Amino acid sequence: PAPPPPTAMIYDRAAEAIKSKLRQLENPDPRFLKHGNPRPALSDHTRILAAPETRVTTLPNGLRVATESSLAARTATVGVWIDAGSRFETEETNGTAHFLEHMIFKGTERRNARELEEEIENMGGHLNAYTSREQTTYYAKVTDSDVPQALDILADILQNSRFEENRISRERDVILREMQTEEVIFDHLHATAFQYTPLGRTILGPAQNIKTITKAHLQSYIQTHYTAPRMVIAASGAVKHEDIVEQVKKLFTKLSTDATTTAQLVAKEPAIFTGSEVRMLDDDIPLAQFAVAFEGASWKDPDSIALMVMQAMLGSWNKTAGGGKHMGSELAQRVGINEVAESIMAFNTNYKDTGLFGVYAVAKPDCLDDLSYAIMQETTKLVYRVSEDDVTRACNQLKSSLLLHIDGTSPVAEDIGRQLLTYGRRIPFAELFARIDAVDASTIKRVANRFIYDKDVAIAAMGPIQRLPDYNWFRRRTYWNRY
Amino acid sequence: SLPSLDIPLGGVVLPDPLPDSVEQSKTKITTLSNGLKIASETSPNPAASIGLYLDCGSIYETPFSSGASHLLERMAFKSTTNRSHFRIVREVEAIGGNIGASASREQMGYTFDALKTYVPQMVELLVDCVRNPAFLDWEVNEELRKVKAELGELSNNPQGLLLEAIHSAGYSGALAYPLLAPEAALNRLDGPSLEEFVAENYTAPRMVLAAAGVEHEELVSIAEPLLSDLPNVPRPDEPKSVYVGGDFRRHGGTHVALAFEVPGGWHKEKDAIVLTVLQMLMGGGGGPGKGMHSRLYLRVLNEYQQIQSFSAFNSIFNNTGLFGIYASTSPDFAPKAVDIAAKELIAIASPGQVTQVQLDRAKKSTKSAVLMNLESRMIASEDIGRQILTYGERKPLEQFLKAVDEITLNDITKISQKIISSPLTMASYGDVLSVPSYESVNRKF
Amino acid sequence: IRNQRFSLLKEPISSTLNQHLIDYPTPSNLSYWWGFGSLAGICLVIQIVTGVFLAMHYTPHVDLAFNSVEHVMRDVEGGWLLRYMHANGASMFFIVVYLHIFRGLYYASYSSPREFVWCLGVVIFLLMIVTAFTGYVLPWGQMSFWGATVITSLASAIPVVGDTIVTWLWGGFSVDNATLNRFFSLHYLLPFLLVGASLLHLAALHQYGSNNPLGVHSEMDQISFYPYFYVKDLVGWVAFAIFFSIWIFYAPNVLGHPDNYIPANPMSTPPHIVPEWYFLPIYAILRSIPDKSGGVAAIALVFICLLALPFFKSMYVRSSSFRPIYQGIFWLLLADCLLLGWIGCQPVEAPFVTIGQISSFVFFLFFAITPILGRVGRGIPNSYTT
Amino acid sequence: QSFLDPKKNWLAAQHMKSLVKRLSKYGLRYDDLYDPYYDLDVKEALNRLPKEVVDARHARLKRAIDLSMKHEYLPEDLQAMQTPFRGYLQDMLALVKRERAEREALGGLPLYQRSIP
Amino acid sequence: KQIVPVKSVIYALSPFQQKVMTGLWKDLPTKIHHKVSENWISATLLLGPLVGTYAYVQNYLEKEKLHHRY
Ligand code: HEM
Ligand code: HEM
């Protein structure tokens, strides 16, 4: 007989088809590969990074007004950033910041409560608020011609706000009803890392302390923490700086005047990182979520940019991420290849005198030990062996993320306010890029030796975490004995 | 030993600031002779977003595929003929950009975000990925498994399920094809099917390459040697869909949703604006400015308790419209919630039930929402792409603003009357054994 | 399934034994050449038992070792059978180990997955060589004493610490009672280290699975080890028992050296000092290149080549049945090894030394030609494709 | 390659003839000799190969092992119909090796590593 | 180490329903012919250097012995 032809049997036909597909895939096209390059390299963006001048003016009372004028835009964002939060308040008043945030839009001497909301909706803008552990923000996004109305509303709610017992009771009920596994993990991590420190306590505060607040603690907190030197009026978009300054001078006149300041409060009660770990074993949740954190760096620390690049190198991976196994970050690559974690993310937090840098991960209870090992191995490679290619990739990613986060007038105003409250100035894009470019493999190694090498960790875990390695395991894996 | 972040860093070559009032650039569109629409506009921010959009989707899908759009969205920026998936992602991460793929019933797009410096890299990568992707069987199988997992854990968002049920039940034809592939169609989907779908649908006249912050000359110079050599396949006839109405009832509180059909979609530009303004006036819910004083919030949500969620929704496609109310209440009071929604729909239809102040507030909210939404580079590029795909050109924002100004009580009442006249579509999911019958609910209109 | 008791083999008391000796899946096409591992294990057990029963009548003293051996031969009931079993079974243990090694060489039973198995085998080979050397020194015959002297004198080849090492190993300035006691203790100790190494050997192989004569991936057609490979191993054991009885009861001293029956005389020397027959290839490799440090380096290079054999790459085709060139190379290697062993039992005259020099070169040419052939034949499918 | 081509070299032609004769006796292709446990690149290639091809390879391997166990070869007709060197794995193996090479060149991490035995 | 499945149909006969040792001494000339023909190259390569080297050594020793005969 004779051998069968290559188009006679099913397996032969399938092999021929797949070979044809591979052959058609083999040949590349230079015209489709001339410009792209998979190896990152530093680039010059001096020409690209052109932004409107951010005018900053200091009134004689200490108030700061910063504007990013862009008359082309048809909208604008005007807000007040206050250097106050859960940290700068005592134990007996722990939910006061959040309660005041909820009550700030509920009634005042002239705009009432429902009338204020009706005016805001008729104006069309959105008036939002949020309080962090160290910053408070009340900002309104309004059209170009409605900026004076938004500024007047902000000044009225900030100064002439009057609270009624019925509204306080209703908001207390709402807060109790309100009282996010990632958020609770972060709160537990903050508590276990800054125990016996104002940063340790949560923003919401205890229920009894929340209920024991009525019309007096709120006013005292305002008079203590809403002074002129601690507030910044940030305007972005279709705003004129001279008009904004004149209107702020006209309106903000009944501000509190106290000699207390955030620096003095921090000096009186500083922040200390205490290595520790908390485990909330439940086993009824399908996924286990744990966060590990280190000392970290403060806002006014030259190594803050290094920490940003470091957390960029650590990276973030998700089950729905397009990159999957094929990614720059070594930790993300390991996690995606081995299918150990549901979602991993490196987080870097900065405060007035300290911070928090680490990894927060969600994973099945079976792969917890392998995921923890991978996290620790990458975090210690981060000090022992750092590649220039990885450093350049992370610097490019950090620059891109910082520039893409701008993307609108309201985030421009938020960036202006936050950078002012943190530094005393708004860092220009070119200077920020120079700071990022100044970070290299040696700088990364030095910063990681400063912050991660044989340092206590703060661990907060929740869920089915019976397989999670313990604190001694983590502490010993923080360093390598081979080097 | 760099200085602290408070102190400026030594000597920098920082550029001079932009003027306060930079001249807003007008959109520039050039038609590559195969029929491909390349558009761009200039923005002052250092970030550039480039998207590439097509008329593909569930409407252009065939019964053979039934999920090709979703799988193409999942199989986006994967291994191509020229470079592998590893090279794709490494090139993406080297410049720090972010990729994205959006799949819709009428049009689907691939977007890329990075700095203005890497314009050629963005254009090259997008054009390569869209034009010649290699649908590898292993990658397709991995994506299919991921979609299996997503469908197995899909019940977490009942709003999308209700919208899909409404679109499948109230339509019979092109628009009735689900956006999410079913089990059998997912199983029979594969690499050759995806490749045939792309080859027969990704034809030159149906690509719009939009840029949000890229100068036109550079974008044209980069994209001409990459898209000029493309077959000039004539545009296939737009798939036809006929509205019939119906009821979807699934057991799994309970979430009900009614819907209708306004004749004419985006092409009837004034009526589309009226529909959007009416949706904003309806509002809903589940600080100030998020439609807190909308009609549904004022008369249905806060007035009547035990209603977990109550909002209005709309969907406008080319020469097609859909408007309705999505409700989510306790199963004990589902029929009364449905009756209340019907009464609200009828009340809007009846003239004189909408306050002039309420309609002025709705107009202001719509204008502010549009203006603040088009403040993002990604939204600007998406708007350029969708507008050129639909109307053949990017209509100026002044036209939309003037239409919103021109809407009035008579026009909104007429549009509501046209909404009521269309056959009713219903979709209810959850404890659905106590909801009223479809015929009974339809008799109210 | 675990609710109530089932077959006692699956019980935890016999679970590991069942999984590793009864229900363990092995390829169904294994030839009779795969029973040599079990046969070598049986030989090792025989050596351990026989030595344990010989040490009850052996005195490790220079004035009593030979007399104790003769007392075992004559006065002890069955002692002649015991010592003949011990010596001839050491010989058969080396025979079956050589067959084991050469079958592995033929079928490439080491290449990718069994690299650790091959390394453990090399360690086992070193342990057997040392144990057999010390055991041969134990009877304190003329040949035993002088072979011990010479082979320990090889240790005086490290340029710095060779003299110190050889003096410390000797227990003094010459092979004497201290050396005899030292070698007796080591010769008793090592076989248990050999048992541990053999257990690690078996476990490391059981991690992946036994190779087959085809060299192909054998998991679709596999059978349980006990009902089918215990009978084949039994046939091998009975054939080996016939061979072993033939070499014990009729030709006991043929493999041994007659000079070992002369009491050790340090003053006199035998005309030809030769080690046991199974050390002859190593002795010939030593004496091929004219040097002492050179010879020790050559032996070390031989063992390094054996250790580095599994770590060569691009050996995609495993079995030599589908490699004509490699089969010819292997047969030339076996002929070279036999010729080298024959040369090791010959003087240092001109033809013998020339042939020994050539034979070692061929022996290392085998270890180079194998990677060369693998790299060359990696591209076979593209060239013969039809 | 020059000397490896059976057309230009007589020694290569005889080697190819002997290899074809040896493979056809047990009725398995040359790529069947590749071991998935050997390189793990063969493992990845077989994972990417279609189920029909993988099943056919496994059937051929089982037939060869059974023939070796029985100490017999394929009959003359089946030996004649045997077609060794009709590749099905070489292209995908080369693709996997190229992907591994580019991954190694561009930093990266191995998608799979052989476990220490 | 996991068993791979292959679709097959296997027919097997009881060990006591068929001859056991009769198939050993059957087709012996054919078996011997296959052993000789398939392995003659291997036998030549194994016994080639051995016999030639033995003959060369014997010739060299004989030549030296007669050379030193005085
Ligand atoms: C712990 C177990 C063992 C003991 C107690 C032991 C003890 C002895 C004793 C006392 C002798 C000298 C008696 C005589 O040969 O008649 C001897 C000889 C010998 N032993 Fe061992 N032995 C053991 C294991 C082994 C092993 C495993 C080997 C093989 C590697 C081995 C190889 C030899 C050799 C080659 C001789 C020389 C026999 C001769 O020609 O006289 N022994 N052993
Ligand atoms: C004390 C002597 C030895 C004993 C008891 C021993 C025992 C065994 C056993 C029981 C097996 C499994 C059965 C088999 O596959 O044959 C085996 C396999 C093996 N042994 Fe050994 N062995 C010994 C010496 C060696 C040596 C010196 C080597 C050389 C490195 C070696 C290399 C191998 C290899 C490669 C296999 C795998 C067989 C295959 O998969 O084809 N062994 N041995």
Tab-separated table of C-alpha atoms and ligand atoms in Angstrom, chain C residues 33-38 40-41 44 93 97 100-101 103-104 107 109-110 114 117-122 124-125 128 194 198 201-202 205-206 209-212, ligand 2:
chain	number	residue	atom	x	y	z
C	33	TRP	CA	17.376	-5.280	31.644
C	34	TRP	CA	15.198	-3.377	34.140
C	35	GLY	CA	15.405	-6.079	36.812
C	36	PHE	CA	19.036	-5.248	37.525
C	37	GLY	CA	18.170	-2.494	40.005
C	38	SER	CA	16.217	-4.938	42.151
C	40	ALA	CA	21.571	-5.063	42.836
C	41	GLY	CA	19.401	-4.357	45.871
C	44	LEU	CA	23.471	-5.442	48.665
C	93	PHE	CA	27.078	-6.864	43.065
C	97	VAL	CA	25.825	-2.511	39.044
C	100	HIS	CA	22.688	-1.309	35.553
C	101	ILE	CA	24.952	1.603	34.600
C	103	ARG	CA	21.757	-0.200	30.455
C	104	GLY	CA	21.119	3.323	31.711
C	107	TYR	CA	18.605	3.821	27.049
C	109	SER	CA	17.672	6.717	31.535
C	110	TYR	CA	19.242	9.882	32.964
C	114	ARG	CA	16.255	11.363	36.203
C	117	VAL	CA	18.572	9.580	39.965
C	118	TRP	CA	21.818	9.448	37.974
C	119	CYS	CA	23.629	11.658	40.501
C	120	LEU	CA	22.469	9.446	43.373
C	121	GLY	CA	23.657	6.456	41.363
C	122	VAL	CA	27.098	8.030	40.974
C	124	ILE	CA	26.234	5.016	45.251
C	125	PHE	CA	29.033	3.953	42.898
C	128	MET	CA	30.478	0.863	46.676
C	194	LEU	CA	24.735	2.536	50.945
C	198	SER	CA	19.742	3.194	47.601
C	201	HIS	CA	17.805	6.366	44.629
C	202	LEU	CA	14.543	4.412	44.491
C	205	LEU	CA	13.227	7.411	40.454
C	206	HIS	CA	9.692	6.858	41.780
C	209	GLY	CA	8.814	6.974	36.676
C	210	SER	CA	10.976	4.307	35.097
C	211	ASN	CA	12.226	4.769	31.553
C	212	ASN	CA	11.259	2.254	28.873
F	2	HEM	C1	23.448	-0.120	45.001
F	2	HEM	C2	23.304	-0.239	43.683
F	2	HEM	C3	22.059	0.168	43.003
F	2	HEM	C4	20.787	-0.213	43.297
F	2	HEM	C5	20.325	-1.137	44.394
F	2	HEM	C6	19.936	0.430	42.369
F	2	HEM	C7	18.561	0.218	42.436
F	2	HEM	C8	17.725	0.696	41.463
F	2	HEM	C9	16.358	0.404	41.369
F	2	HEM	C10	15.574	-0.476	42.306
F	2	HEM	C11	15.882	1.058	40.284
F	2	HEM	C12	14.453	1.010	39.823
F	2	HEM	C13	14.243	-0.221	38.938
F	2	HEM	C14	14.883	0.002	37.596
F	2	HEM	O1	14.500	0.904	36.890
F	2	HEM	O2	15.877	-0.796	37.180
F	2	HEM	C15	16.950	1.767	39.691
F	2	HEM	C16	16.824	2.553	38.563
F	2	HEM	C17	17.867	3.322	38.054
F	2	HEM	N1	19.135	3.367	38.475
F	2	HEM	FE1	19.876	2.299	40.006
F	2	HEM	N2	20.642	1.191	41.515
F	2	HEM	C18	21.944	1.075	41.838
F	2	HEM	C19	23.052	1.669	41.247
F	2	HEM	C20	22.911	2.594	40.229
F	2	HEM	C21	23.966	3.300	39.651
F	2	HEM	C22	25.418	3.177	40.032
F	2	HEM	C23	23.429	4.121	38.680
F	2	HEM	C24	24.189	5.041	37.817
F	2	HEM	C25	24.058	6.356	37.936
F	2	HEM	C26	22.022	3.902	38.668
F	2	HEM	C27	21.162	4.559	37.817
F	2	HEM	C28	19.815	4.224	37.717
F	2	HEM	C29	18.920	4.800	36.711
F	2	HEM	C30	19.283	5.812	35.658
F	2	HEM	C31	17.712	4.242	36.918
F	2	HEM	C32	16.459	4.520	36.132
F	2	HEM	C33	16.072	3.298	35.304
F	2	HEM	C34	15.200	3.729	34.157
F	2	HEM	O3	14.229	4.630	34.359
F	2	HEM	O4	15.380	3.264	33.059
F	2	HEM	N3	21.734	2.958	39.632
F	2	HEM	N4	18.080	1.528	40.440
